[PDB]
Design an enzyme around this catalytic site. Structure first.
Site, PDB file in Angstrom:
ATOM      1  N   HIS A 125       6.944  -6.357  10.730  1.00  0.00           N
ATOM      2  CA  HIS A 125       6.220  -5.099  10.968  1.00  0.00           C
ATOM      3  C   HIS A 125       5.623  -5.045  12.376  1.00  0.00           C
ATOM      4  O   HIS A 125       4.417  -4.888  12.567  1.00  0.00           O
ATOM      5  CB  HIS A 125       5.148  -4.873   9.895  1.00  0.00           C
ATOM      6  CG  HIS A 125       4.581  -3.488   9.871  1.00  0.00           C
ATOM      7  ND1 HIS A 125       3.840  -2.971  10.910  1.00  0.00           N
ATOM      8  CD2 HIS A 125       4.629  -2.521   8.926  1.00  0.00           C
ATOM      9  CE1 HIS A 125       3.465  -1.741  10.611  1.00  0.00           C
ATOM     10  NE2 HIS A 125       3.930  -1.444   9.412  1.00  0.00           N
ATOM     11  N   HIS A 182       0.843  -1.192   0.000  1.00  0.00           N
ATOM     12  CA  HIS A 182       0.000   0.000   0.000  1.00  0.00           C
ATOM     13  C   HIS A 182       0.879   1.243   0.000  1.00  0.00           C
ATOM     14  O   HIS A 182       2.081   1.187  -0.276  1.00  0.00           O
ATOM     15  CB  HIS A 182      -0.991  -0.026   1.165  1.00  0.00           C
ATOM     16  CG  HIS A 182      -0.356  -0.095   2.512  1.00  0.00           C
ATOM     17  ND1 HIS A 182       0.144  -1.265   3.035  1.00  0.00           N
ATOM     18  CD2 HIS A 182      -0.191   0.847   3.468  1.00  0.00           C
ATOM     19  CE1 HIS A 182       0.612  -1.035   4.245  1.00  0.00           C
ATOM     20  NE2 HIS A 182       0.425   0.240   4.532  1.00  0.00           N
ATOM     21  N   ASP A 209      -0.008  -4.619   5.726  1.00  0.00           N
ATOM     22  CA  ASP A 209      -0.796  -4.169   6.865  1.00  0.00           C
ATOM     23  C   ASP A 209      -2.260  -4.381   6.521  1.00  0.00           C
ATOM     24  O   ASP A 209      -2.782  -3.739   5.605  1.00  0.00           O
ATOM     25  CB  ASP A 209      -0.531  -2.703   7.190  1.00  0.00           C
ATOM     26  CG  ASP A 209       0.879  -2.458   7.650  1.00  0.00           C
ATOM     27  OD1 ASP A 209       1.500  -3.401   8.181  1.00  0.00           O
ATOM     28  OD2 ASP A 209       1.364  -1.321   7.489  1.00  0.00           O
ATOM     29  N   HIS A 212      -7.612  -1.958   5.446  1.00  0.00           N
ATOM     30  CA  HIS A 212      -6.725  -1.094   6.231  1.00  0.00           C
ATOM     31  C   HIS A 212      -6.407   0.274   5.627  1.00  0.00           C
ATOM     32  O   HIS A 212      -6.291   1.246   6.377  1.00  0.00           O
ATOM     33  CB  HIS A 212      -5.417  -1.853   6.507  1.00  0.00           C
ATOM     34  CG  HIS A 212      -4.235  -0.974   6.756  1.00  0.00           C
ATOM     35  ND1 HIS A 212      -4.208  -0.013   7.742  1.00  0.00           N
ATOM     36  CD2 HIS A 212      -3.037  -0.906   6.133  1.00  0.00           C
ATOM     37  CE1 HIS A 212      -3.042   0.604   7.716  1.00  0.00           C
ATOM     38  NE2 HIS A 212      -2.314   0.081   6.749  1.00  0.00           N
ATOM     39  N   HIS A 241      -6.179  -1.948  12.135  1.00  0.00           N
ATOM     40  CA  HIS A 241      -5.283  -3.095  12.115  1.00  0.00           C
ATOM     41  C   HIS A 241      -5.992  -4.286  12.738  1.00  0.00           C
ATOM     42  O   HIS A 241      -7.208  -4.247  12.946  1.00  0.00           O
ATOM     43  CB  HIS A 241      -3.981  -2.810  12.860  1.00  0.00           C
ATOM     44  CG  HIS A 241      -2.989  -2.017  12.070  1.00  0.00           C
ATOM     45  ND1 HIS A 241      -1.912  -2.599  11.438  1.00  0.00           N
ATOM     46  CD2 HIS A 241      -2.903  -0.691  11.817  1.00  0.00           C
ATOM     47  CE1 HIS A 241      -1.207  -1.665  10.828  1.00  0.00           C
ATOM     48  NE2 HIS A 241      -1.787  -0.499  11.041  1.00  0.00           N
ATOM     49  N   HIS A 254       1.578   3.622   2.398  1.00  0.00           N
ATOM     50  CA  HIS A 254       2.172   4.234   3.574  1.00  0.00           C
ATOM     51  C   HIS A 254       3.684   4.323   3.426  1.00  0.00           C
ATOM     52  O   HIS A 254       4.308   3.509   2.741  1.00  0.00           O
ATOM     53  CB  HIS A 254       1.789   3.456   4.824  1.00  0.00           C
ATOM     54  CG  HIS A 254       0.390   3.708   5.270  1.00  0.00           C
ATOM     55  ND1 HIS A 254      -0.311   2.831   6.064  1.00  0.00           N
ATOM     56  CD2 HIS A 254      -0.430   4.762   5.059  1.00  0.00           C
ATOM     57  CE1 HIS A 254      -1.508   3.328   6.313  1.00  0.00           C
ATOM     58  NE2 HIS A 254      -1.605   4.500   5.713  1.00  0.00           N
ATOM     59  N   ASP A 298       6.176   3.784   5.383  1.00  0.00           N
ATOM     60  CA  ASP A 298       6.947   2.626   5.800  1.00  0.00           C
ATOM     61  C   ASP A 298       6.756   1.430   4.879  1.00  0.00           C
ATOM     62  O   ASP A 298       7.265   0.350   5.180  1.00  0.00           O
ATOM     63  CB  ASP A 298       6.594   2.242   7.235  1.00  0.00           C
ATOM     64  CG  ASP A 298       5.117   2.125   7.448  1.00  0.00           C
ATOM     65  OD1 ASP A 298       4.405   3.053   7.044  1.00  0.00           O
ATOM     66  OD2 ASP A 298       4.659   1.104   7.996  1.00  0.00           O
TER      67      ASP A 298
HETATM   68 ZN   LIG Z   1       0.107   0.538   6.947  1.00  0.00          ZN
HETATM   69 ZN   LIG Z   2       3.102  -0.521   8.206  1.00  0.00          ZN
END
Ligand SMILES: [Zn+2]
Ligand SMILES: [Zn+2]
EC number: 3.1.27.-
Lengths: 77, 81, 499, 76, 83, 114, 311, 106, 74, 510
Positions: C410, C63, C171, C150, C388, C65, C67
């Site tokens: 993660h 995705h 995630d 998410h 989450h 994000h 990170d």
């Molecule tokens: Zn995420």
């Molecule tokens: Zn993450």
RNA sequence: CACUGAAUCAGAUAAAGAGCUGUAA
RNA sequence: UUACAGCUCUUUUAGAAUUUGUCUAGU
């Protein structure tokens, strides 16, 4: 900065009251968002009542106190 | 019949093409009127006149000026003579 | 030839800078490369130097994000990478603006930047897009992504290299949402699960009990004439919060006079992605698109800056950044913290060292950005909106698949180790299921053996307990054994004869 | 005109003595304003200049014509 | 969006108001339409000049920058916006 | 000190001389008005349009009648003189206020506040 | 609704729009009076040209594009729209004069062709052509203007001035779009007002201004590579000046300006290769293969790319 | 530490405050009024009344503005109240430029 | 051919002008430079009040909102 | 040796419908069922006896020629089986049937299928995506399903049946190889050499002009009519090819230097708002050029700022008097495309641009070829009484400028014939198109193919036993692959000559 | 404990630059 | 490989000239 809604006064006989006691009449032919008027067949009403045909003029909108209607002008609700 | 409106920037520009003598009325100054011929005008209605002259309504004097640049803040009317 | 090495180059026993190298039978796949949001400079990259980018085949970004996709313009452009990278359709349209905001915030920081926006835009042509559930093939690697939940556009990349089926979940969330669906349990069971471990053994408050506690909090602030500040991230849970408050004001005629704002120039540029990609929503929105788009708001407008609106009467303004470092979510706080009627709602999350975590202890007096000290008298309520999975949603996800090898990424080291200790004592009593959970750190490879029979096919003239002789073609891993005659019938190249 | 540094919400619904450019003194309940100092004053007073007092009511005051605002008292 | 007093002036469209200009004239009359820049179209006007006289007009149109203050009707003080 | 919470209102200040008399918020000055009235009090939170919100004034009318007030708010257009105090050093209190805006405009980042 | 009542309503609308969004309304007025009903162009001409005195700069650039599209539809209107085109050429903005030079590029060939189709001329039409040729000579003086863009469009005007004011030959390679444009061969010499010998020396005096502009040491980079392509257009279309263009190519090749950096010196060296390769196909260039083939070796061109284009 | 140098082997505006607008305006009347900042020229500013002239301020000039706002320091103002000339001394003043009439130089 | 007011002042710098202000004050001098708001810097400026000489001022910087007309004098 | 046979239920010899029944070893794929324009019953009686030997109905391109019979085959004929179709076939094919019912319900008592049958047929349908391999579970076990892009309409598919092995039974009808504006072209290279190809020959003899050449003659026909103060009727689809022209027009009505926006685009469907509202939701289903201009500039490409959408004749009259309307139905048989035809075919200053070539028994085929003027055609109204429908006949005197401009997205006969030649299908059938053009495609695939192609041209209600023997048995390599070199798919990288024993599932021992 | 933000003023200033898409040669 | 329109961006500069953001009434 919206323009004036002077389309109701188009081709109507106005009687303008400028600043300094000066007073003109005549027929409106157009305007702008600065309210600068164009007055066809404009007549200068002097302080002594003497009328003076001054042709058609450009009147800067910064010095227009009030404009009354010598003819009938449409109204909203 | 709806006519196209005569906007004020048209009719000042109409004096520029015609080379027609105008007579400016002044903002909060009733006695004096500048009377010239438009050679150019500005975004803010700054008139460049020619053979301009101050027309005092009480003195009846015609003080010759010449090639002046009247500013836009002072105009309240543009009579055509 | 025989081993499979999952080497976490990032998010091994930590949250952030995710990266996983997947080496099996000559093919290397790097999963979901991002930066670490809590480091500086070149330290925020993953341990990319432990490999060479010239031989990485795939690159599957889960995705948008930071990170999970943040180190990507450094990697696609400023290295020797020549493979093929893949996102979902809704990830890439947020990727370009989420990361245009990254090099604007990292511009007013130290000037040891990773990349610039002109290096971001020339990375957009190298990124291909996989849609959901579709099987794409690169160098003999079938891979197809599922709905991860998410965020809008996340993906669980199933990967099949020579019959070894792996699932990287990224995630994921498994609760049904206003604009998202749950994480899909595949109908294909993986041999290796690489799963997040963000919470470990925590738990959530129930969804009908959080959205009731949220809507009562917003309503009690505007009933006492106060202003409602909801500091939230621009893209994670801001869009879901909006659906709650817009729906809640269709159901209440008296609250139509006061207004709800969202104040972000990143949520403005990315609201069109939520309006367009309706097929990556859940079934609730894509059956409500028949009437009108729910991300074309009926009572919520954008706030460009706080000069634009007059602060007359009650209002609900949800600005960004979420942890109130600086920006408009901080100046709306400092303008509103000196009144008892106003109320702040910490809907997202906090990190130790921000203003949104310092406020939860109820300090008597907070510090303005200019150094002034203002008395904090507005009400503070912390209502989590995690998106989450807790332990009851991660363990349910792992009972449904039953993977023989589970790798935890993660998650911080204390919450990842408590998750491994709970997964081991949940499968040490029953005998027919066997799960071998791993929690590798950075650089620590996970060696897994997958020896499998090689099966070929005869279908040419050899197809009609005898002898078999002929030429054999290996396409990528699929074998076919054919006649010498049948190279102009099946194989592209028919013959070779010299005189 | 007025920006948000001058907190005009401090004196909302108070009784405000507003001095105009001509010299007239408006005293009325400060109902609402805008970014141009258009003042909605309620139950007004008009003190010209020995000096005469006039009861006006609900006066909208154009913000070009405002000199100084000061507090006459608490909300009645 | 426009401010509250301009919206309050639009809620007085169709009532008898009092307008005083920069030159000292006081214009008492029914106002038909007011604009965002306070350009007030009015009707059936009773004027009161600076020297002090009474004339009566039919329909006027006042420039918004040449209005010193507007006296709204005392009915209008119970508006839903002034609360 | 205190700056505005509006980018529209602090950048009119940063680009103009107003940031001068925002540097002397809290000092007792004398604000001479455009209509030859005198207001003498403590400056609190003058904005980008010179709307001076004085604190405790010996306000003088333009006919000479001192009416001592306990709050006064001068319109920006009705100002001509701001008698700034003697111990100010103009070019330094401008550079102090430009330093305060420069630390609000940047203001650090994440993981460094506490 | 009638077009002559739709145009009026679109001009009452475009007279009250303040910002630069009036030209969306105002280009609709263009398409209704020059394309849909061209008989209304004589009626609403005085109300479109009134917008050349506008505050905005794209509204007075609309008027330059409008006069271009009205004089190519009715060239009789050039008797009125030429007094309104020099004051858009003498304008104080620099994007407005660049549009006024583009319009004078097309409306010089069409204006000259209109002056010679008229076997008899009028004294009001005499006042038009000496006003076109006066403002055509002022764009020549705009080669000395202090803007990079005024100098660039004026180079593309004088290549449309040299080709127009110099006659054709048998080997004058003229493209299919420039075919029916006027040259100095289809001029009349027994014409009453305009004279052959005036326009004869006018075409080469405009050449001398273009030549000494390029040997200037402080010439810009994009003004140079436009002037290189303009010497290549007055060589293929006019082989009378083939001896002069090659003399100006070798003067620039022996004397490059030192003021432009190496990243754009090589852009001059690349584009000079393209125009000398394109002039080689022209059959009047076979006289001067001792100069063109000498210069192409110094630019780094092999013998095979020179020998392939020999006709 | 050392790892940043292992990652760099795989690689195969100005402030615009009020005081920076002081040395500008050079081809304008306002930038000539910046020489009074530099050279220290005594500046006597004429101040408008409602219509005409009110007084002359006569001070050393510090830190002007676009709007002709300026902070005169060694002020000796000779003004007239609506013929009674009353001169008063101000050790530092701020004159906003709406009221200035013409900046005389000495 | 028309002569707009921004080319009018730019063709008048260095020449003796006589700027008349809005209330009878009048200042002749050498126009040095003007800007977009038409602030008028005048050098060697002497003041004419009521058409008569009051006093040679020196260098005079007239604000934009005071000029009634500028006149090229000779 | 799977028993692959297909029976042409309809859709051959220019009965321009589609409904096929491809059996794969007692698993009856009913390929792509559809009505024609005037609703003949020659497919309905041909589907009474096949509505119970049926499973896995595989739809295609969203239009009534490919899914029109499906509200009647589900609501009345009662088939309870999986219906595999991609998401724009689900959302635009539902949009055709709401504009096939209502466009006739404004004119006549139409009770063949109701709207409760459109919803019933479009709820028991499994939305797929392109290259989504769907493994069937049931009486067809080894069969996998893969839709691939075709490029004709939005989300238009070719299918790829794969038996357990490599029996590859691709059904590619009405495809398009070119990259148009809002679609990208068909691939047909992920499939290499199939076991059966079911293709069309509708344009096998058609010499198609260039797309750049026929965008000019559209723009010439649209402008010249409007400069002469006259309306333009354009007969398009309601969701399929209207998205091409409304994107073709609006990028011209934006990006021409003249003031084009005075001339009032329209888009008349009965359900027209949901057409542009769903097409601005399937942006991931469109052309890469058209998708990159959303991911970099946040403009939805179906956010039209000139298309004034209209739902009826009442909404149409409130636009300015010259207008370019793209009509509901491509044939001039029903809807507003017929109603706007009759209103202004009697006025010479108007133009009528037919963009799609329909079934030969229609009024719009009567105007593409054989252009006549004084002709007789029925007029179907519905007056207020609660209403009642009127049928009457008129002589209309067509004197507007009728012009056919080819905006159907299909391949021409130099590329519908090049792709079959660039492929090598081991068996081919030619399944709809005229007999004049099916022979032109059969006598090139047999000619410039191999000795073993065996093309077919089946007639109507004719089955074809297209099952060819290439017996396949699955041998797993037992001991060694070390002494060989194992070359690859790309080129002659290595050489892998292998001998061995069997052990009869069987293995290989040296 | 889950991963960044209104870029130094108005929904339209002006010069010089950029990139994409399309259409005219 | 040139030239025009369509949208997305980058530095410089404006954001002090007629209806509220820098005064010919403060009578
Ligand atoms: Zn995420
Ligand atoms: Zn993450």
């Amino acid at each position: 900065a919206h323009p004036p809604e002077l389309k109701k006064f188009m081709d109507k006989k106005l009687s303008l009251k400028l600043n300094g006691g000066r007073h003109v009449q005549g027929i409106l032919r157009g305007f702008d968002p600065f309210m600068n008027l164009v007055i066809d067949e404009c007549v200068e009403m002097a302080t002594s009542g003497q009328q003076n045909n001054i042709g058609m003029v450009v009147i800067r909108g910064n010095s227009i106190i009030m404009l009354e209607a010598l003819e009938r002008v449409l109204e909203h609700h | 019949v709806q006519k196209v409106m005569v906007q004020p920037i048209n009719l000042i520009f109409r004096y520029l093409q015609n080379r027609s003598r105008i007579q400016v009325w002044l903002y909060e100054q009733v006695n004096m009127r500048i009377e010239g011929c438009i050679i150019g005008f500005d975004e803010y209605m700054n008139l460049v006149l020619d053979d301009a002259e101050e027309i005092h309504s009480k003195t009846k004097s015609r003080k010759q000026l010449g090639r002046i640049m009247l500013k836009g803040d002072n105009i309240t009317l543009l009579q055509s003579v | 030839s025989d081993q499979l090495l999952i080497r976490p180059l990032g998010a091994g026993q930590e949250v952030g800078r995710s990266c996983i190298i997947l080496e099996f039978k000559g093919r290397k796949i790097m999963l979901d490369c991002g930066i670490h949001p809590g480091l500086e400079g070149m330290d925020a990259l993953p341990y990319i130097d432990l490999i060479d980018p010239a031989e990485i085949d795939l690159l599957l970004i889960s995705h948008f994000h930071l990170d999970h996709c943040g180190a990507l313009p450094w990697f696609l452009q400023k290295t020797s990478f020549k493979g093929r990278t893949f996102m979902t359709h809704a990830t890439k349209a947020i990727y370009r603006w989420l990361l245009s905001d990254y090099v604007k915030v990292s511009n007013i920081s130290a000037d040891d930047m990773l990349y610039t926006e002109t290096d971001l835009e020339e990375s957009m042509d190298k990124i291909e897009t996989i849609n959901f559930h579709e099987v794409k093939e690169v160098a003999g690697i079938k891979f197809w992504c599922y709905h991860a939940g998410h965020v809008l556009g996340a993906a669980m990349f199933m990967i099949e290299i020579a019959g070894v089926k792996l699932l990287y979940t990224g995630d994921f969330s498994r609760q049904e949402d206003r604009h998202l669906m749950a994480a899909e349990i595949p109908n294909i069971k993986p041999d290796i699960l690489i799963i997040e471990s963000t919470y470990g053994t925590h738990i959530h408050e129930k969804r009908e009990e959080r959205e009731a506690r949220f809507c009562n909090t917003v309503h009690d602030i505007v009933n006492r004439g106060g202003r409602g500040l909801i500091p939230v991230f621009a893209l994670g849970r801001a869009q879901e919060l909006l659906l709650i408050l817009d729906e809640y004001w269709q159901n209440h005629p008296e609250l139509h006079d006061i207004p709800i704002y969202y104040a972000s120039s990143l949520a403005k540029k990315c609201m069109a992605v939520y309006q367009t990609y309706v097929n990556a929503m859940n079934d609730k929105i894509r059956k409500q698109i028949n009437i009108n788009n729910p991300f074309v708001f009926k009572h919520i407008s954008n706030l460009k800056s706080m000069d634009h609106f007059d602060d007359i009467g009650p209002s609900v303004v949800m600005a960004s950044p979420g942890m109130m470092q600086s920006g408009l979510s901080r100046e709306l706080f400092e303008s509103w913290c000196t009144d008892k009627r106003n109320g702040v709602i910490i809907a997202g999350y906090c990190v130790e060292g921000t203003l949104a975590k310092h406020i939860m202890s109820e300090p008597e007096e907070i510090t303005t950005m200019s150094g002034q000290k203002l008395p904090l008298k507005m009400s503070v309520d912390y209502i989590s909106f995690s998106a989450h999975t807790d332990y009851q949603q991660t363990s349910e996800f792992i009972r449904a698949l039953k993977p023989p090898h589970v790798i935890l990424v993660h998650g911080e080291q204390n919450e990842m180790a408590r998750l491994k200790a709970a997964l081991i004592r949940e499968y040490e009593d029953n005998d027919e299921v066997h799960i071998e959970v791993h929690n590798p750190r950075n650089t620590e490879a996970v060696t897994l053996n997958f020896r499998g029979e090689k099966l070929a096919k005869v279908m040419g003239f050899l197809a009609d307990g005898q002898r078999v002789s002929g030429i054999l073609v290996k396409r990528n891993f699929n074998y076919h054994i054919l006649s010498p005659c049948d190279l102009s019938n099946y194989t592209d190249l028919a013959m070779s004869t010299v005189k | 005109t007025v920006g948000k540094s001058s907190k005009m919400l401090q004196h909302i619904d108070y009784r405000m003595r507003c001095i105009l450019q001509d010299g007239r003194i408006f005293i009325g309940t400060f109902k609402a304003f805008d970014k141009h100092m258009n003042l909605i004053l309620c139950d007004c007073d008009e003190f010209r200049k020995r000096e005469e007092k006039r009861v006006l009511g609900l006066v909208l005051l154009r913000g070009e014509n405002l000199v100084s605002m000061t507090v006459e008292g608490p909300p009645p | 969006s426009i401010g509250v007093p301009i919206k309050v002036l639009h809620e007085a469209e169709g009532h008898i108001v009092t307008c005083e200009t920069n030159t000292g004239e006081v214009y008492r009359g029914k106002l038909i339409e007011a604009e965002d820049n306070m350009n007030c179209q009015m009707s059936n006007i009773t004027v009161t000049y600076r020297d002090g006289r009474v004339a009566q007009l039919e329909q006027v149109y006042i420039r918004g920058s040449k209005i010193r203050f507007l006296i709204l009707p005392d009915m209008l003080k119970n508006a839903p916006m002034l609360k | 000190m205190a700056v505005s919470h509006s980018v529209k209102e602090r950048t009119i200040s940063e680009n103009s001389l107003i940031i001068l008399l925002q540097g002397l918020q809290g000092r007792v000055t004398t604000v001479d008005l455009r209509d030859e009235s005198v207001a003498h009090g403590r400056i609190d939170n003058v904005d980008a349009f010179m709307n001076i919100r004085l604190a405790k004034v010996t306000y003088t009318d333009r006919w000479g009648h001192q009416v001592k007030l306990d709050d006064l708010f001068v319109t920006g257009r009705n100002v001509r003189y701001v008698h700034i105090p003697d111990d100010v050093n103009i070019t330094s209190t401008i550079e102090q206020q430009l330093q305060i805006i420069h630390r609000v405009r940047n203001f650090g980042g994440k993981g460094q506040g506490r | 609704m009638t077009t002559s009542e739709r145009v009026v309503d679109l001009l009452n609308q475009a007279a009250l729009i303040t910002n630069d969004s009036k030209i969306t309304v105002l280009k609709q007025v263009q398409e209704l009076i020059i394309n849909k009903d061209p008989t209304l162009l004589d009626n609403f001409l005085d109300e479109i040209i009134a917008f050349q005195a506008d505050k905005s700069i794209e509204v007075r650039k609309f008027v330059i594009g409008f006069i271009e599209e009205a004089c190519k539809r009715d060239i009789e209107l050039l008797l009125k729209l030429i007094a309104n085109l020099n004051m858009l050429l003498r304008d104080e903005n620099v994007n407005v004069v660049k549009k006024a030079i583009l319009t004078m590029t097309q409306l010089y060939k069409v204006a000259l062709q209109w002056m010679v189709k008229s076997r008899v001329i009028s004294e009001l039409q005499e006042a038009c052509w000496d006003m076109v040729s006066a403002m055509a000579g002022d764009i020549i003086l705009l080669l000395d203007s202090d803007n990079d863009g005024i100098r660039t469009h004026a180079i593309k005007f004088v290549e449309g001035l040299i080709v127009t004011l110099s006659p054709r030959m048998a080997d004058s390679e003229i493209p299919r779009r420039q075919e029916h444009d006027i040259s100095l061969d289809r001029i009349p010499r027994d014409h009453p007002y305009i004279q052959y010998n005036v326009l004869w020396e006018e075409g080469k005096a405009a050449l001398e201004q273009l030549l000494k502009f390029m040997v200037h040491p402080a010439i810009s980079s994009i003004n140079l590579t436009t002037a290189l392509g303009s010497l290549a257009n007055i060589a293929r279309q006019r082989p009378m000046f083939m001896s002069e263009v090659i003399q100006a190519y070798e003067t620039l090749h022996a004397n490059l300006p030192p003021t432009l950096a190496k990243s754009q010196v090589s852009s001059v060296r690349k584009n000079l290769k393209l125009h000398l390769l394109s002039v080689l196909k022209h059959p009047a260039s076979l006289e001067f293969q001792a100069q063109i083939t000498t210069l192409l070796v110094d630019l780094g061109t092999p013998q095979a790319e020179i020998a392939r284009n020999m006709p | 530490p050392e790892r940043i140098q292992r990652l760099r082997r795989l690689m195969v505006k100005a402030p615009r405050n009020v005081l920076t607008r002081m040395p500008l305006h050079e081809g304008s009347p306002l930038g000539e009024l910046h020489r009074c900042i530099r050279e220290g020229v005594k500046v006597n500013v004429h101040i408008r009344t409602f219509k005409g002239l009110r007084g002359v301020c006569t001070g050393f000039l510090v830190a002007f503005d676009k709007f002709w706002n300026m902070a005169l320091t060694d002020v000796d103002e000779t003004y007239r109240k609506p013929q009674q000339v009353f001169t008063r001394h101000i050790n530092q003043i701020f004159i906003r430029g709406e009221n200035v009439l013409l900046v005389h130089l000495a | 051919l028309p002569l707009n007011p921004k080319p009018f002042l730019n063709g008048l710098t260095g020449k003796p002008v006589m700027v008349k202000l809005k209330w009878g004050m009048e200042y002749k001098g050498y126009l040095v430079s003007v800007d977009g708001y038409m602030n008028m810097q005048l050098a060697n400026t002497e003041e004419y009040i009521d058409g008569a000489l009051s006093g040679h001022l020196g260098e005079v910087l007239i604000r934009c909102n005071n000029v009634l007309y500028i006149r090229g004098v000779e | 040796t799977s028993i692959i046979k297909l029976t042409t239920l309809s859709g051959v010899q220019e009965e321009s419908a589609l409904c096929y029944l491809l059996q794969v070893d007692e698993f009856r794929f009913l390929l792509d069922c559809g009505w024609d324009e005037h609703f003949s019953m020659d497919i309905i009686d041909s589907l009474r006896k096949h509505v119970h030997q049926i499973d896995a109905v595989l739809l295609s391109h969203p239009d009534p020629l490919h899914l029109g019979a499906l509200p009647y085959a589900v609501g009345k004929l009662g088939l309870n089986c999986a219906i595999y179709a991609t998401i724009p076939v689900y959302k635009m094919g539902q949009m055709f049937m709401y504009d096939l019912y209502q466009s006739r319900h404004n004119t006549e008592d139409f009770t063949l299928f109701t709207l409760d049958d459109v919803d019933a047929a479009f709820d028991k349908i499994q939305q797929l995506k392109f290259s989504q391999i769907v493994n069937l579970k049931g009486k067809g076990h080894g069969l996998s399903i893969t839709p691939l892009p075709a490029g004709h309409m939005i989300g238009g598919t070719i299918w790829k049946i794969v038996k357990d092995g490599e029996e590859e039974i691709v059904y590619a009808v009405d495809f398009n190889h070119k990259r148009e504006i809002h679609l990208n072209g068909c691939s047909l290279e992920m499939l290499s050499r199939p076991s059966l190809l079911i293709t069309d020959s509708f344009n096998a003899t058609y010499v198609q002009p260039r797309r750049k050449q026929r965008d000019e003659q559209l723009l010439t026909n649209v402008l010249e009519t409007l400069r002469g103060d006259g309306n333009v009727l354009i007969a398009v689809d309601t969701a399929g090819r209207v998205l091409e022209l409304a994107q073709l027009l609006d990028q011209i009505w934006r990006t021409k230097d003249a003031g084009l926006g005075v001339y009032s685009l329209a888009l008349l469907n009965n359900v027209s708002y949901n057409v542009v509202e769903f097409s601005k939701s399937q942006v991931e289903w469109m052309s890469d050029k058209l998708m990159r201009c959303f991911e970099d500039k946040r403009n939805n490409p179906f956010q039209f700022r000139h298309l004034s959408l209209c739902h009826g004749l009442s909404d149409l009259a409130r636009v300015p008097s010259p207008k370019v309307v793209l009509a509901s139905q491509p044939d001039l048989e029903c809807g507003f495309s017929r109603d706007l035809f009759i209103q202004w075919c009697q006025d010479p200053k108007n133009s009528i641009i037919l963009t799609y070539r329909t079934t030969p028994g229609t009024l719009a085929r009567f105007l593409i070829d054989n252009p006549s003027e004084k002709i007789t055609e029925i007029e179907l109204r519905k007056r207020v009484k609660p209403t009642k429908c009127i049928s009457t006949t008129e002589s209309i005197e067509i004197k507007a400028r009728v012009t056919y401009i080819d905006y159907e997205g299909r391949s021409d006969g130099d590329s519908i014939k090049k792709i079959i030649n660039q492929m090598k299908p081991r068996q081919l059938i030619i399944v709809h198109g005229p007999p004049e053009a099916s022979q032109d495609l059969a006598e090139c695939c047999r000619a410039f193919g191999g000795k073993d192609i065996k093309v077919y041209m089946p007639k109507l209600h004719e089955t074809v036993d297209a099952t060819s023997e290439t017996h396949i048995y699955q041998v797993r390599l037992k001991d060694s692959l070390v002494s060989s070199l194992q070359f690859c798919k790309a080129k002659d990288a290595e050489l892998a000559w292998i001998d061995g024993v069997l052990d009869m599932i069987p293995t290989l021992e040296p």
